[PDB]
Design a protein around this nucleic acid. Structure first.
Lengths: 62, 337, 132
RNA sequence: AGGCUAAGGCGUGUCGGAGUAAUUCAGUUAAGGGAAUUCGGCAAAUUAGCUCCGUAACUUCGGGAUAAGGAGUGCCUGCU
RNA sequence: CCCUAACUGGAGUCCGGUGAAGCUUACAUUCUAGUGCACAGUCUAGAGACCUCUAGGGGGAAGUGAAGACCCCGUGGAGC
RNA sequence: GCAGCUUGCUACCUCGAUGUCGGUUCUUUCCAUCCUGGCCGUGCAGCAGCGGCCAAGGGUGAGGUUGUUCGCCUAUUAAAGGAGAUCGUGAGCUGGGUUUAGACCGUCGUGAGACAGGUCGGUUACUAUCUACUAGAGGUGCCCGAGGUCUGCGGGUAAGCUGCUUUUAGUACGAGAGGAACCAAGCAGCGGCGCCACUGGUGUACCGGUUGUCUGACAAGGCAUCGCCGGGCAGCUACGCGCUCAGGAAUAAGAGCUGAAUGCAUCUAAGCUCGAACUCUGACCUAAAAAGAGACCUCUUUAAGGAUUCCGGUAAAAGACCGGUUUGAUAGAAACGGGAUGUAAGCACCAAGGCAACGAGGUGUUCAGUCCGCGUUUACUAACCAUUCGUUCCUUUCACUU
């Protein structure tokens, strides 16, 4: 059972759910939900988005 | 005219498509007895769907041996009571009910369905049935059973549902003996079905009320310029000039759903006793949480949540002994997420 | 053909102009028909990952252009589910020129191919640099 | 112009309603494909203001021309 | 369009009030075949059919609207 | 000779109108069968053809030109058969063509004008009375009164059809080249039925950002398509998901057994065995309004039980259906769980700068604030109060009572 992490929110992909998104350059990103996929496609960054773990890490950097 | 052909819109195998006359599915056929005596059917209530991660044990499949995510239907299956034994006589005009014996003690909430049969003749009724079997007036025996939904909480009803079930035995005497053993008892779903086996599921489908021919039969819409000339969701023609009538085979609006349907070869993936194993966080939406014993049926089942689902041993199963599924993970994440 | 492990929606229908992503000299090919596909009335021929289509080279070299060829789609934007429940989607649609047997006319494939096509036609997998 | 508001004029011309089903008039949105629909891109969609750069064949030398094709644009602080 | 889905407001659906018009010799729950001015719910022989009500799209009533504008005829007209 | 699906002939019906071609949508039928099933012959080695017989259960598609029918062409395909139904189908649609009024070109004619020549443009009416069908109800008949469970006279069904790949097998066959069949497996196309864990759409619940304007400013709000933009739970939905072999009987063509007429022979004249995607049965749906109007059991005969009122939803256009009703979690409130959005207001510090007044915005407070048409716990309020039928009504034509 592959254990997968959401690229945007950093949450573990629950088995039997979630998406894998592949760009032209072979880059692969796990998405836990349509919300994370939409925010990734909008160009928003997780480190700037507060509800994600990367945004939380960026804020707690201070 | 050189015509383009298409398959007919919908199936005429379910006509007339009317509302089912009861909320309970009735079985018109019972399969062959192929072993020790037992009931051929059980009845539970549909809860909802989840999914499991399991190892593909299906022989000859390409993905056999690997992790696969399989949707499952959860069916809450409290113990049913064997209320009565009914005997049937076969003649030229078919089967007729000839005798019935009710169990001496029955659940008090059965009065919501019927006035309770008294604790009257059971010994002499059984000996009468034995005499009838000995003298050859009995063609077969069925068990009248009923569910006890009071123990459930996602099903609001306390009135039991009553239905006839076949008995699987090699001989009529064996059938009668087994029915006498099981009469008046509480049978669990493990006493009817085993894990990993195929079954047939009957249920009343989701009711959609009155629906047009587009949704009801899958007829094409009007296309292009015709889409906005005033008949968009509406059948092109009701018939030819001759014959001067609308055929019953022309797709038309009417009752959609709330029909009896039988699905074949649904595999049981788990017989559980504790509903906490399958209940997600937050509960099943509009249902709640499982509390009694339950069953996992591979794939989908007819009917919505809380509908009574009748399970029976398979009547057209292809595959031989399938095995016990290896459920590696039952998903209990929030279905409301 | 050999069955694939995944369930593939036939996402590209006839008339779609897909970028051709090998070194054969075809830049854009329009789907004409789908091999081994029988349709129904009014339904356009449909193709998902792993399907072989007859294509016409609309852009590319002048020798490739206007030729009726066979191509295999290796990337599709429509999401498809693997057996273990994970959904996969690519950033674009992409095809590679092949023969009837499935051998690619090109020698290297720029971009990731789907594992489904990589297994159904093993030579596409070897020609591709990475299989996703 | 369009939007939101004064003053002034009005609520003036059938109601209610439990999903208020199907269907229909007029709208919003729609994965992937993108005219494969159709007699025909009909209908719908695209573009869109202003500033700056740049603007072809042809021409009756007037034009074509807003051709085409690109870039900018909000708020705040201080200014020329 | 492939191939449709969901949603918004107005109708429709159900309720209160108000309240017309158009087809109509009669009867009438029909269906098949034949017959018949050779395209019958009514004739003939069969087959079906318990009655009433509600909703629904229009197969049929060679449905309704209309003394065919096409053709011919009239020792009928008009204009050119 | 057949058919009447081409074109003719005729003028019997219709001129107080049966709306004219083609397409589209939907249903059905025929077989003279294109494929799929079964056979026979071959100048049939196999592969694959050619010819014929049975067989109408299913399929027979997508595109370019043309109004086309027809036809040509393209690439798939097992094949992309043909025809009938008022040349099916305009109280369904379209209007490209033909069949009005305008105009141009060519040709006729002195001319008006004409052309089964071409071209551009050119209004598609109606609230369904009856019948038919699709669905939903109320009755009456059947019937000890009521309820429940069944049966199945019958009706319907495509209770699925068809390809690819692997294997058989580089085998039989064949000198080679080439190249099968039974069985077995998976997948796919189309069809059917259902479902919503997953994924996608929608989601005018909800959350946030922001433009213009109004309510004096902030905050909170109105309006501009939900103002627009981003996200989205439930629900619905497909572009998602599950299921969707058979076997047996009796047959067609056909192949045989036995067998005389006709000592022999003969598949046939009796008799018998096989033999199809056909038919029937069989795994599905419907079906006591089956007039032979059903069987069984239970309860109870001023009762059983049903309806109405009440709180609802697995159901629902009205009806109906399914549940609960204090001996109760049916619905709602409260809190919590599980979710949506994205970090509220106020406060403090910082802020490019400005002498200052101010200052877009950043950080902390703060995964905050707001919200939940989901669940759990919980009788906290509301499921209370009742009515009505099961009596022909008045009457003493009474099984009763002032």
């Amino acid at each position: 059972m592959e254990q997968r992490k959401c690229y945007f929110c950093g949450k573990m992909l629950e088995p039997g759910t979630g998406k894998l998104y592949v760009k032209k350059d072979g880059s692969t990103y796990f998405m836990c939900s349509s919300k994370c996929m939409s925010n990734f496609a909008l160009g928003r960054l997780p480190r700037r988005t507060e509800w994600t773990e990367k945004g939380k890490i960026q804020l707690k950097k201070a | 005219m050189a015509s383009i052909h298409r398959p007919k819109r919908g199936s005429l195998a379910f006509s007339p498509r009317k509302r089912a006359k009861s909320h309970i599915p009735r079985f018109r056929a019972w399969p062959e007895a192929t072993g020790e005596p037992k009931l051929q059917s059980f009845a539970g209530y549909k809860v909802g769907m989840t999914h499991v991660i399991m190892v593909d044990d299906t022989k000859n499949s390409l993905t056999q041996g690997m992790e696969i995510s399989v949707p499952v239907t959860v069916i809450e299956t409290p113990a049913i009571r064997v209320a009565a034994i009914r005997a049937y006589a076969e003649d030229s005009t078919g089967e007729k009910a000839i005798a019935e014996v009710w169990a001496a003690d029955l659940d008090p909430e059965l009065k919501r369905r019927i006035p309770i049969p008294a604790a009257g003749n059971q010994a002499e009724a059984l000996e009468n049935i034995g005499k009838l079997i000995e003298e050859g007036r009995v063609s077969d025996v069925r068990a009248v059973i009923y569910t006890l939904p009071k123990s459930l909480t996602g099903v609001p009803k306390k009135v039991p549902d009553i239905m006839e079930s076949g008995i699987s035995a090699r001989d009529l005497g064996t059938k009668f003996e087994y029915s006498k053993t099981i009469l008046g008892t509480l049978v669990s779903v493990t006493d009817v079905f085993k894990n990993g086996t195929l079954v047939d599921t009957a249920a009343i489908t989701i009711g959609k009320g009155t629906q047009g021919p587009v949704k009801r039969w899958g007829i094409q819409l009007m296309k292009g310029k015709h889409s906005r000339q005033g008949s968009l969701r509406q059948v092109g023609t009701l018939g030819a000039f001759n014959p001067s009538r609308v055929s019953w085979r022309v797709p038309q609006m009417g009752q959609m759903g709330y029909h009896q349907r039988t699905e074949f070869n649904k595999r049981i993936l788990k017989i559980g006793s504790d509903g906490e194993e399958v209940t997600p966080e937050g509960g099943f939406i509009n249902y709640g949480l499982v509390r009694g014993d339950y069953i996992l049926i591979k794939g989908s089942v007819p009917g919505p949540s809380k509908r009574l689902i009748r399970l029976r041993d398979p009547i057209r199963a292809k595959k031989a002994d399938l095995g016990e599924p290896n459920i590696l993970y039952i998903s209990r994440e929030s279905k409301q997420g | 053909m050999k069955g694939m492990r995944s369930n593939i929606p036939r996402a590209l229908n006839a008339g779609a102009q897909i970028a051709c992503v090998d070194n054969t000299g075809a830049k854009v090919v329009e789907i004409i028909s789908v091999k081994k596909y029988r349709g129904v009335k009014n339904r356009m021929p449909c193709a998902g990952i792993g399907d072989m289509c007859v294509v016409s080279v609309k852009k590319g070299t002048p020798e490739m252009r206007k030729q009726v060829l066979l191509a295999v789609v290796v990337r599709q934007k429509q999401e498809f589910r693997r057996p273990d429940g994970l959904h996969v989607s690519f950033e674009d649609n992409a095809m590679v020129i092949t023969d009837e047997e499935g051998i690619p006319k090109g020698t290297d494939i720029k971009g990731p191919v789907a594992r489904e096509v990589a297994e159904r036609f093993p030579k596409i997998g070897t020609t591709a640099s990475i299989i996703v």
